[PDB]
Amino acid sequence: AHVKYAVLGATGLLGHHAARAIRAAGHDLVLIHRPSSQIQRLAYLEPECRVAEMLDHAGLERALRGLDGVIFSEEVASALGQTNPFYAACLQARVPRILYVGSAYAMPRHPQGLPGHEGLFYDSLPSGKSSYVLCKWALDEQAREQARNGLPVVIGIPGMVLGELDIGPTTGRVITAIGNGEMTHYVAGQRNVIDAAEAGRGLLMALERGRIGERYLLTGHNLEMADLTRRIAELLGQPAPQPMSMAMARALATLGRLEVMAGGQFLDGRKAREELGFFSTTALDDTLLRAIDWFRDNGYFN
Amino acid sequence: AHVKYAVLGATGLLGHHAARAIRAAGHDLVLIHRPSSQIQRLAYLEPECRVAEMLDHAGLERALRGLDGVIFSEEVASALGQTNPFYAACLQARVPRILYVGSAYAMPRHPQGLPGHEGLFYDSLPSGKSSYVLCKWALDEQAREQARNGLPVVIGIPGMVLGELDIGPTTGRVITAIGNGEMTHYVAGQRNVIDAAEAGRGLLMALERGRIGERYLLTGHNLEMADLTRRIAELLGQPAPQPMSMAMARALATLGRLEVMAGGQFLDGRKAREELGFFSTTALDDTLLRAIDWFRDNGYFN
């Protein structure tokens, strides 16, 4: 297995599937993990494991030795505080190839309402926007900034990732909320959903094939929240969540005083397809069913 | 003016009206304030002002000298942290008569759904309830605990206080939210509303006349939130806020994850009436109009 690729955050949903994709390609897999993390869930991949706390420049450098590449999986300041040492260590370890996993919320909304693409940038500080968007904009700026400064950083930006192995769960709380009768309503909104297994392969592909300093949207299905809500319901044998007005959402925010909860957009997958060879082939139902089954076997449904 | 009564928190809505009531009764008024507070808004009452930070036992003791009585106007721990020194200082200053301003949220809901009364107690820690209720239950327990231990504490519990001189505003954000088009919806609920001017007189009356260690509900009008919402709208020349389901409120709380906002009850005013001679005589519209006018003259409406 002539090539060695590492993954930080391998126990998260999207990292676990990057790790798998590296194993599926027949590369040597390295997993850089914090000592507290339960990386033995990935022992089946026969990984090489390197311990490193993410604020420990001696240990990151050491964990980043002899790699052909690496995937990376008070709110703004400390987001930047975690990534900054990593980039530091990548420079010292002389890693040739770095992919940083970004978010589509680093991008503004397509100004004609069409599906979003990699060319959508905020000219400067996304002022007046949520702190979520701000944090996501910063991490995006930071990565490009390392590219500009001669670091080999590629940026891979998946849509909402859904699939099996979602421990929290995280993104798949939609599935469990619905299944457990909790999500009784939804708010209108556009969203791109992507199968976890694929998003992992897309990451590997950006890492091996992306242009340094470029973003690549890794997309699945463009979807109304009504329809994502409804399909999951139908599959779980449950009633469809009913729509809830946008005004009725702010009116609760206002009762509070005494959002980006449906601020997503559709994504254009062409760049990844033409440059990376990447695109989804999995039916959405197959993804939603595989997630559903994983959650059920592990008792996330009451 | 043979009797001297003091008020802490005189710049708040309910304290300002206690202060006024003390002036209206022809007593000598003392205002105990923190040095940062803008107590010169009450200079027209020709008050005697005593400076005291509320965590400064030397200064409270000194500010509590030679009084015939006093009205008192991480969330639980620090609520108790503010009151505890005050009670300490009342013991050393030998104040004969102390009224603590409580909340109706220290009481559980009438177990047959009738209007609530002073006999409603939680037998012990109000477990599983909101931290708001918990904090309000504690301060209530604390006051009774000082009574039990020989301190002359009376507890006065007004309903939702509405009227003029509401600086934040605080309770009157309902009025301004509606007026400014912000409160577009409300959640079903029962509530007791009381005129500010009166609630101040009720406080004075509890202080002079209550039994040591007893609670006294100071009540105005029992009101559906639909009707309070609607009257304020009609008076402001605005559309009535529309009802919003309770389920639709939790369904937003649940979208968040990826209350007591209508948990109030009606209050029974009989104890205050029979013992204190207290009861409301003011039409609700007159109260809502006086508040409305105060807010308007000071430019709280856009």
Reduced to 3 states (helix: H, G, I; strand: E, B; else coil), residue B145 is helix
> What residue in B sits closest to A258 (Cα-Cα)?
B173
- DSSP assigned state of A48: E
Q: Please judge whether A252 and B252 are an interchain contact, meaning their C-beta atoms are less than 8 angstroms apart.
A: yes
Rg of chain A (C-alpha set)? 19
Q: Which residues of B10-22 are buried (b: 16+ CB within 10 A; e: fewer)?
A: bbbbbbbbbbbbb
The answer to whether B193 and B220 have CB atoms below 8 angstroms apart is yes
Q: Which CATH superfamily is domain B1-302 in?
A: NAD(P)-binding Rossmann-like Domain (3.40.50.720)
Reduced to 3 states (helix: H, G, I; strand: E, B; else coil), residue B126 is coil
Q: Contacts of residue B177 in chain A, CB cutoff 8 Å?
A: 254, 257-258
φ, ψ for residue A81, nearest 5 deg: -65, -25
Distance separating the N- and C-terminal Cα atoms of chain B: 44
To the nearest whole angstrom, how far is the Cα of A248 from the nearest Cα of chain B?
7
Helices A225-236 & A284-297 angle (0-180, nearest 10): 50
Nearest by CB to B251, from A174, A183, A254: name it: A183
Q: Contacts of residue B183 in chain A, CB cutoff 8 Å?
A: 251, 254-255
Could you state, in order of their start, the residue ranges of all structural domains in chain B? 1-302
Helices B131-148 & B75-93 angle (0-180, nearest 10): 20
Please tell me the distance from the alpha carbon of residue A68 to that of residue A50, in angstroms, as a whole number. Answer: 15
Reduced to 3 states (helix: H, G, I; strand: E, B; else coil), residue B212 is coil
Q: Which residues pair with A6 in a beta bridge?
A: A30, A70
Q: Please judge whether A261 and B257 are an interchain contact, meaning their C-beta atoms are less than 8 angstroms apart.
A: no
Amino acid sitting at position A165: L
Q: Contacts of residue A187 in chain B, CB cutoff 8 Å?
A: 255
Q: Please judge whether B177 and A247 are an interchain contact, meaning their C-beta atoms are less than 8 angstroms apart.
A: no
Q: Please judge whether A185 and B248 are an interchain contact, meaning their C-beta atoms are less than 8 angstroms apart.
A: yes
Rg of chain B (C-alpha set)? 19
Tokens representing A123? 């000219």
Q: Which residues pair with A155 in a beta bridge?
A: A100, A215
To the nearest whole angstrom, how far is the Cα of A174 from the nearest Cα of chain B?
8
Q: Contacts of residue A241 in chain B, CB cutoff 8 Å?
A: 251
- Chains A, B: CB contacts within 8 A come to 62
Instruction: Tell which residue, B15, B10, B52, B11, has the closest CA to residue B34.
Output: B52
CA A72 to chain CA centroid, nearest Å = 10
3-state secondary structure A102-134: CCHHHCCCCCCCCCECCCCCCCCCCCCCCHHHH
Please tell me the distance from the alpha carbon of residue A232 to that of residue A171, in angstroms, as a whole number. Answer: 13
Q: Contacts of residue B244 in chain A, CB cutoff 8 Å?
A: 248, 251-252
For A30, A62, A276, B282, the CA distances from A58, given in Å and listed in that order, are 18, 6, 34, 74
Contacts of A16 (CB under 8 A, 6+ apart): A10, A41, A42, A165, A200
Reduced to 3 states (helix: H, G, I; strand: E, B; else coil), residue B195 is strand
Please tell me the distance from the alpha carbon of residue B18 to that of residue B29, in angstroms, as a whole number. Answer: 10
Distance separating the N- and C-terminal Cα atoms of chain A: 44
Q: Which residues of B150-184 are buried (b: 16+ CB within 10 A; e: fewer)?
A: ebbbbbbbbbbbbbbbbeebebbbbbbbbbeebbb
Reduced to 3 states (helix: H, G, I; strand: E, B; else coil), residue A240 is coil
To the nearest whole angstrom, how far is the Cα of A99 from the nearest Cα of chain B?
26
The answer to whether A70 and A64 have CB atoms below 8 angstroms apart is yes
Please tell me the distance from the alpha carbon of residue B101 to that of residue A6, in angstroms, as a whole number. Answer: 62
Amino acid sitting at position B221: H
Please tell me the distance from the alpha carbon of residue A228 to that of residue A221, in angstroms, as a whole number. Answer: 10
Whether the upstream peptide bond of residue A152 has omega within 30° of 0, thus cis, is no
CA A95 to chain CA centroid, nearest Å = 22
Tokens representing B201? 């007189």
User: Which residue pairs from A237-245 have beta carbons closer than 8 angstroms and sit at least 24 positions apart in sequence?
Assistant: A238/A178, A238/A179, A238/A181, A241/A178, A241/A183, A241/A184, A241/A185, A241/A186, A241/B251, A242/A184, A242/A185, A242/A186, A243/A185, A243/A186, A243/A187, A243/A188, A244/A185, A244/A186, A244/A187, A244/B248, A244/B251, A244/B252
The sign of the CA dihedral A164, A170, A176, A180 is: positive
Cβ neighbours around B247 below 10 Å, total: 10
Please tell me the distance from the alpha carbon of residue B37 to that of residue B210, in angstroms, as a whole number. Answer: 30
Sheet holding B48-51, edge to edge: B48-51, B28-33, B4-8, B69-72, B98-101, B153-158, B215-218
φ, ψ for residue B150, nearest 5 deg: 90, 15
Please tell me the distance from the alpha carbon of residue A213 to that of residue A211, in angstroms, as a whole number. Answer: 6
| Residues of chain A with a CB closer than 8 angstroms to some CB in chain B | 173-174, 177, 182-187, 241, 244, 247-252, 254-258, 261
> What residue in A sits closest to B245 (Cα-Cα)?
A248
Q: How was this structure determined?
A: X-ray
CA B62 to chain CA centroid, nearest Å = 26
Instruction: Tell which residue, A297, A299, A287, A274, has the closest CA to residue A117.
Output: A274
Residue A87 gets the label, from left (phi > 0), alpha (psi -120 to 50) or beta, of alpha
| Quoted resolution (Å) | 2.7
For chain A, give the longest Cα–Cα distance: 62
To the nearest whole angstrom, how far is the Cα of B183 from the nearest Cα of chain A?
6
Tokens 């400067």 belong to which residue? A124
| Residue B59 half-sphere exposure toward CB, CA atoms < 13 A | 13
Please tell me the distance from the alpha carbon of residue A176 to that of residue A76, in angstroms, as a whole number. Answer: 29
Q: Please judge whether B257 and A174 are an interchain contact, meaning their C-beta atoms are less than 8 angstroms apart.
A: no
To the nearest whole angstrom, how far is the Cα of A247 from the nearest Cα of chain B?
8
Q: Contacts of residue A247 in chain B, CB cutoff 8 Å?
A: 184-185
Strands A221-224 and A190-195, how do they pair? Answer: antiparallel
Instruction: Tell which residue, B37, B131, B145, B138, has the closest CA to residue B80.
Output: B138
Residue B5 parent element (H or E): strand B4-8
Q: Please judge whether A183 and B254 are an interchain contact, meaning their C-beta atoms are less than 8 angstroms apart.
A: yes
Amino acid sitting at position A163: G
Reduced to 3 states (helix: H, G, I; strand: E, B; else coil), residue B43 is helix
φ, ψ for residue B117, nearest 5 deg: -145, 170
Amino acid sitting at position A2: H
Taken as a whole, chain A contains a residue count of 302
Which among A255, A258, A260 is the top mutation candidate for probing chain B, defined by the most B β-carbons within 10 Å of its own β-carbon?
A: A255
Contacts of A280 (CB under 8 A, 6+ apart): A194, A195, A198, A219, A220, A221, A269
Please tell me the distance from the alpha carbon of residue A167 to that of residue A145, in angstroms, as a whole number. Answer: 32
Instruction: Tell which residue, A126, A135, A133, A155, has the closest CA to residue A143.
Output: A155
Amino acid sitting at position B140: D
Residue A222 parent element (H or E): strand A221-224
Which among A130, A170, A187, A248 is the top mutation candidate for probing chain B, defined by the most B β-carbons within 10 Å of its own β-carbon?
A: A248
Whether the upstream peptide bond of residue A169 has omega within 30° of 0, thus cis, is yes
Please tell me the distance from the alpha carbon of residue B131 to that of residue B137, in angstroms, as a whole number. Answer: 9
Query: Measured at the alpha carbon of residue A172, what is the angle toward residues A167 and A175, in degrees to the nearest 5?
Result: 125
Strand positions, DSSP E, A171-214: 185-187, 190-195
φ, ψ for residue A117, nearest 5 deg: -145, 170
Instruction: Tell which residue, A13, A21, A24, has the closest CA to residue A196.
Output: A13
Which among B130, B170, B186, B258 is the top mutation candidate for probing chain A, defined by the most A β-carbons within 10 Å of its own β-carbon?
A: B258
> What residue in A sits closest to B168 (Cα-Cα)?
A258
Nearest by CB to B249, from A186, A187, A252: name it: A252
> What residue in B sits closest to A254 (Cα-Cα)?
B183
Which among B252, B254, B259 is the top mutation candidate for probing chain A, defined by the most A β-carbons within 10 Å of its own β-carbon?
A: B252
Cβ neighbours around B104 below 10 Å, total: 23
Q: Contacts of residue B255 in chain A, CB cutoff 8 Å?
A: 183, 185-187, 261
Please tell me the distance from the alpha carbon of residue A184 to that of residue A243, in angstroms, as a whole number. Answer: 9
Q: Please judge whether A261 and B261 are an interchain contact, meaning their C-beta atoms are less than 8 angstroms apart.
A: no
Tokens representing A136? 């996501």
Please tell me the distance from the alpha carbon of residue A24 to that of residue B188, in angstroms, as a whole number. Answer: 56
